[PDB]
Protein backbone atom coordinates (compact mmCIF):
# COMPACT_ATOMS: atom_id res chain seq x y z
CA UNK A 1 0.00 0.00 0.00
CA UNK A 2 2.63 2.52 1.83
CA UNK A 3 6.10 3.23 -0.31
CA UNK A 4 8.84 1.25 0.81
CA UNK A 5 12.02 2.81 2.40
CA UNK A 6 14.03 1.98 -1.03
CA UNK A 7 10.73 3.44 -3.06
CA UNK A 8 11.17 6.69 -1.00
CA UNK A 9 14.80 6.64 -1.99
CA UNK A 10 13.99 5.77 -5.46
CA UNK A 11 11.40 8.70 -6.18
CA UNK A 12 13.35 11.14 -3.87
CA UNK A 13 16.69 10.08 -6.63
CA UNK A 14 14.33 10.60 -9.78
CA UNK A 15 13.14 13.81 -8.29
CA UNK A 16 16.46 15.11 -7.88
CA UNK A 17 17.57 14.69 -11.67
CA UNK A 18 14.57 15.59 -13.11
CA UNK A 19 14.55 19.21 -10.97
CA UNK A 20 17.87 19.63 -13.89
CA UNK A 21 15.44 20.42 -16.45
CA UNK A 22 14.69 24.14 -17.94
CA UNK A 23 12.32 26.15 -15.44
CA UNK A 24 8.97 25.86 -16.54
CA UNK A 25 8.60 29.32 -16.12
CA UNK A 26 11.37 30.95 -18.17
CA UNK A 27 9.95 29.06 -21.06
CA UNK A 28 6.44 30.63 -21.02
CA UNK A 29 7.37 34.06 -19.48
CA UNK A 30 9.19 34.19 -23.22
CA UNK A 31 6.28 33.22 -25.17
CA UNK A 32 3.22 35.27 -23.29
CA UNK A 33 6.06 38.47 -23.45
CA UNK A 34 5.67 39.07 -27.10
CA UNK A 35 4.75 37.86 -30.38
CA UNK A 36 7.22 36.48 -32.54
CA UNK A 37 7.27 35.68 -36.13
CA UNK A 38 7.09 31.53 -37.59
CA UNK A 39 10.59 31.92 -38.27
CA UNK A 40 11.62 33.22 -34.81
CA UNK A 41 9.24 30.26 -33.16
CA UNK A 42 11.05 27.70 -35.41
CA UNK A 43 14.53 28.68 -34.12
CA UNK A 44 12.94 29.02 -30.21
CA UNK A 45 11.86 25.83 -31.17
CA UNK A 46 14.75 24.12 -32.35
CA UNK A 47 16.65 25.60 -29.40
CA UNK A 48 14.53 24.34 -26.97
CA UNK A 49 14.67 20.89 -28.40
CA UNK A 50 18.32 20.76 -28.62
CA UNK A 51 19.00 21.26 -25.05
CA UNK A 52 15.92 18.90 -24.48
CA UNK A 53 17.85 16.16 -25.92
CA UNK A 54 20.93 16.95 -23.81
CA UNK A 55 19.22 16.98 -20.85
CA UNK A 56 17.23 13.86 -21.50
CA UNK A 57 20.65 12.00 -22.17
CA UNK A 58 21.36 13.32 -18.64
CA UNK A 59 18.29 12.14 -16.90
CA UNK A 60 18.81 9.00 -18.45
CA UNK A 61 22.48 8.22 -17.92
CA UNK A 62 21.08 8.49 -14.15
CA UNK A 63 18.03 5.93 -14.86
CA UNK A 64 18.83 2.70 -12.17
CA UNK A 65 20.67 -0.22 -14.13
CA UNK A 66 20.20 1.79 -17.43
CA UNK A 67 24.29 2.21 -17.80
CA UNK A 68 24.51 -1.80 -17.58
CA UNK A 69 22.60 -1.97 -20.86
CA UNK A 70 23.91 -3.23 -24.34
CA UNK A 71 25.26 -0.08 -25.86
CA UNK A 72 23.32 -0.54 -28.72
CA UNK A 73 20.01 -0.74 -26.76
CA UNK A 74 20.90 2.46 -24.81
CA UNK A 75 20.84 4.65 -28.23
CA UNK A 76 17.62 2.58 -29.40
CA UNK A 77 15.57 3.76 -26.00
CA UNK A 78 16.66 7.16 -26.66
CA UNK A 79 16.02 7.45 -30.18
CA UNK A 80 12.62 5.68 -29.30
CA UNK A 81 11.85 7.94 -26.23
CA UNK A 82 12.99 11.56 -27.46
CA UNK A 83 10.12 12.93 -29.22
CA UNK A 84 7.15 11.38 -26.75
CA UNK A 85 9.62 12.67 -23.66
CA UNK A 86 9.47 16.44 -25.07
CA UNK A 87 5.58 16.35 -25.81
CA UNK A 88 4.86 14.76 -22.13
CA UNK A 89 7.22 18.18 -20.89
CA UNK A 90 5.34 20.60 -23.18
CA UNK A 91 1.83 18.74 -21.90
CA UNK A 92 3.55 19.45 -18.70
CA UNK A 93 4.90 23.12 -18.81
CA UNK A 94 1.04 24.03 -20.83
CA UNK A 95 -0.98 22.69 -17.80
CA UNK A 96 1.12 24.67 -14.64
CA UNK A 97 -1.34 26.99 -13.10
CA UNK A 98 -0.80 30.48 -14.07
CA UNK A 99 -3.03 33.78 -13.24
CA UNK A 100 -6.31 34.81 -15.33
CA UNK A 101 -5.85 34.85 -19.06
CA UNK A 102 -2.41 33.67 -19.49
CA UNK A 103 -2.88 30.22 -20.48
CA UNK A 104 -5.97 31.29 -23.18
CA UNK A 105 -2.94 33.82 -24.50
CA UNK A 106 -0.40 30.46 -24.15
CA UNK A 107 -2.20 28.54 -26.53
CA UNK A 108 -3.39 31.63 -28.95
CA UNK A 109 0.37 32.29 -28.80
CA UNK A 110 1.56 27.82 -29.56
CA UNK A 111 -1.49 28.06 -32.28
CA UNK A 112 0.00 30.95 -34.10
CA UNK A 113 3.52 29.66 -33.79
CA UNK A 114 3.87 28.01 -37.18
CA UNK A 115 2.52 24.56 -37.01
CA UNK A 116 -0.09 23.84 -39.67
CA UNK A 117 -3.40 23.59 -38.69
CA UNK A 118 -3.33 19.82 -39.30
CA UNK A 119 -1.21 19.28 -36.46
CA UNK A 120 -2.89 21.95 -34.24
CA UNK A 121 -5.87 19.66 -33.34
CA UNK A 122 -4.17 16.63 -31.91
CA UNK A 123 -1.60 18.41 -30.53
CA UNK A 124 -4.05 20.41 -27.60
CA UNK A 125 -6.06 17.10 -27.71
CA UNK A 126 -3.02 15.63 -26.11
CA UNK A 127 -2.34 18.26 -23.52
CA UNK A 128 -5.75 18.75 -22.48
CA UNK A 129 -6.03 14.88 -22.22
CA UNK A 130 -3.02 15.20 -19.32
CA UNK A 131 -4.17 18.17 -17.70
CA UNK A 132 -7.66 16.27 -16.93
CA UNK A 133 -5.37 13.54 -14.74
CA UNK A 134 -3.78 16.40 -12.61
CA UNK A 135 -0.76 14.99 -12.85
CA UNK A 136 1.72 16.21 -9.90
CA UNK A 137 5.65 16.97 -10.52
CA UNK A 138 6.42 13.12 -9.41
CA UNK A 139 3.79 11.48 -11.47
CA UNK A 140 5.23 13.38 -14.74
CA UNK A 141 8.81 12.45 -13.41
CA UNK A 142 7.86 9.09 -13.14
CA UNK A 143 5.76 9.04 -16.54
CA UNK A 144 9.31 10.28 -17.88
CA UNK A 145 11.18 7.47 -16.80
CA UNK A 146 8.40 4.81 -17.70
CA UNK A 147 8.34 6.22 -21.55
CA UNK A 148 12.05 6.27 -22.02
CA UNK A 149 12.70 2.61 -20.36
CA UNK A 150 9.64 1.26 -22.80
CA UNK A 151 10.80 -2.76 -23.49
CA UNK A 152 8.18 -2.74 -26.26
CA UNK A 153 10.55 0.21 -28.29
CA UNK A 154 11.66 -1.09 -31.98
CA UNK A 155 15.64 -2.12 -32.05
CA UNK A 156 15.48 -3.70 -28.41
CA UNK A 157 17.58 -6.85 -28.27
CA UNK A 158 17.06 -7.39 -24.72
CA UNK A 159 13.31 -6.53 -24.09
CA UNK A 160 13.79 -8.50 -20.36
CA UNK A 161 16.34 -6.51 -19.27
CA UNK A 162 14.98 -3.02 -20.44
CA UNK A 163 11.31 -4.73 -18.74
CA UNK A 164 13.31 -5.48 -14.97
CA UNK A 165 14.28 -2.09 -15.07
CA UNK A 166 10.60 -0.54 -15.82
CA UNK A 167 8.66 -2.78 -13.36
CA UNK A 168 10.19 -1.25 -10.22
CA UNK A 169 9.24 2.52 -11.56
CA UNK A 170 5.53 1.25 -12.54
CA UNK A 171 5.22 0.19 -8.99
CA UNK A 172 6.21 3.47 -7.38
CA UNK A 173 3.92 5.08 -9.93
CA UNK A 174 0.99 3.03 -8.79
CA UNK A 175 1.64 3.27 -5.26
CA UNK A 176 1.30 7.34 -5.79
CA UNK A 177 -1.84 6.90 -7.66
CA UNK A 178 -3.51 5.09 -4.69
CA UNK A 179 -2.25 7.44 -2.53
CA UNK A 180 -2.96 10.78 -4.21
CA UNK A 181 -6.28 9.80 -5.61
CA UNK A 182 -7.92 7.09 -3.22
CA UNK A 183 -11.54 8.01 -4.61
CA UNK A 184 -10.27 6.91 -8.33
CA UNK A 185 -8.40 3.57 -7.99
CA UNK A 186 -8.70 4.06 -12.28
CA UNK A 187 -6.34 6.79 -12.07
CA UNK A 188 -3.02 4.43 -12.57
CA UNK A 189 -4.64 2.61 -15.58
CA UNK A 190 -5.74 6.04 -17.59
CA UNK A 191 -2.25 7.63 -16.09
CA UNK A 192 -0.78 4.42 -18.53
CA UNK A 193 -3.45 4.87 -21.29
CA UNK A 194 -2.21 8.63 -21.83
CA UNK A 195 1.33 6.73 -23.29
CA UNK A 196 -0.34 5.63 -26.31
CA UNK A 197 -1.95 8.30 -27.68
CA UNK A 198 1.38 10.06 -26.81
CA UNK A 199 3.26 6.74 -29.06
CA UNK A 200 0.96 8.42 -31.97
CA UNK A 201 3.63 11.82 -31.90
CA UNK A 202 6.28 9.40 -33.47
CA UNK A 203 4.54 8.99 -36.64
CA UNK A 204 3.78 12.46 -37.75
CA UNK A 205 6.78 14.65 -35.90
CA UNK A 206 8.72 14.85 -38.75
CA UNK A 207 5.74 16.22 -40.94
CA UNK A 208 4.86 18.40 -38.37
CA UNK A 209 8.14 20.27 -38.72
CA UNK A 210 8.36 20.27 -42.10
CA UNK A 211 4.70 21.40 -42.73
CA UNK A 212 5.93 24.54 -40.32
CA UNK A 213 5.07 27.94 -41.75
CA UNK A 214 9.05 28.67 -42.71
CA UNK A 215 10.65 29.46 -45.77
CA UNK A 216 13.66 26.93 -45.10
CA UNK A 217 13.48 24.29 -42.12
CA UNK A 218 17.17 24.34 -40.49
CA UNK A 219 17.71 22.12 -37.69
CA UNK A 220 20.78 20.90 -35.42
CA UNK A 221 23.36 18.06 -36.26
CA UNK A 222 21.78 16.35 -32.64
CA UNK A 223 18.13 16.92 -34.01
CA UNK A 224 19.28 15.54 -37.34
CA UNK A 225 20.21 12.33 -35.64
CA UNK A 226 17.48 12.29 -32.68
CA UNK A 227 14.24 13.48 -35.04
CA UNK A 228 15.44 11.76 -38.48
CA UNK A 229 15.04 14.84 -40.30
CA UNK B 1 25.35 6.96 -37.73
CA UNK B 2 23.81 8.11 -34.36
CA UNK B 3 27.30 9.44 -33.17
CA UNK B 4 26.58 12.58 -31.28
CA UNK B 5 23.40 10.37 -29.62
CA UNK B 6 26.75 8.12 -28.52
CA UNK B 7 29.23 10.36 -27.71
CA UNK B 8 26.82 12.21 -25.10
CA UNK B 9 25.76 8.02 -24.09
CA UNK B 10 29.84 7.35 -23.63
CA UNK B 11 31.02 10.53 -22.31
O1 LIG C 1 11.93 21.58 -20.68
C1 LIG C 1 12.21 21.58 -21.88
O2 LIG C 1 13.38 21.25 -22.32
C2 LIG C 1 11.22 21.96 -22.96
C3 LIG C 1 10.00 22.56 -22.63
C4 LIG C 1 9.09 22.91 -23.61
C5 LIG C 1 9.38 22.67 -24.96
N1 LIG C 1 8.47 23.03 -25.99
C6 LIG C 1 8.59 24.16 -26.74
O3 LIG C 1 9.49 24.97 -26.61
C7 LIG C 1 7.47 24.35 -27.81
C8 LIG C 1 7.35 25.82 -28.29
C9 LIG C 1 8.40 26.16 -29.36
C10 LIG C 1 8.33 27.65 -29.75
C11 LIG C 1 6.94 28.03 -30.28
C12 LIG C 1 5.82 27.64 -29.30
C13 LIG C 1 5.95 26.13 -28.86
N2 LIG C 1 6.14 23.86 -27.24
C14 LIG C 1 5.31 22.93 -27.83
C15 LIG C 1 5.62 22.26 -29.12
C16 LIG C 1 4.86 22.50 -30.27
C17 LIG C 1 5.16 21.87 -31.47
C18 LIG C 1 6.23 21.00 -31.51
CL1 LIG C 1 6.62 20.21 -33.02
C19 LIG C 1 7.00 20.74 -30.40
C20 LIG C 1 6.69 21.37 -29.20
N3 LIG C 1 4.22 22.71 -27.13
C21 LIG C 1 4.34 23.54 -26.01
C22 LIG C 1 3.49 23.73 -24.92
C23 LIG C 1 3.88 24.63 -23.96
F1 LIG C 1 3.09 24.84 -22.89
C24 LIG C 1 5.07 25.34 -24.05
F2 LIG C 1 5.40 26.21 -23.07
C25 LIG C 1 5.92 25.17 -25.10
C26 LIG C 1 5.53 24.26 -26.07
C27 LIG C 1 10.61 22.07 -25.28
CL2 LIG C 1 11.03 21.75 -26.94
C28 LIG C 1 11.52 21.72 -24.30
Redesign the pocket.
Known amino acids: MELTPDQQTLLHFIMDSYNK??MPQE??NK?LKEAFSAEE?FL??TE??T??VQ?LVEFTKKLPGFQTLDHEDQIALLKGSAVEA??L??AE??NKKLPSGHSDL?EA??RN?G?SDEYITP?FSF?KSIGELKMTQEEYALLTAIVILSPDRQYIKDREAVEKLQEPLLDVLQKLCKIHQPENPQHFACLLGRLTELRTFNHH?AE??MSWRVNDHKFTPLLCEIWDV | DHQLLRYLLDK
Open positions: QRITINILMANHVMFRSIFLRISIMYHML
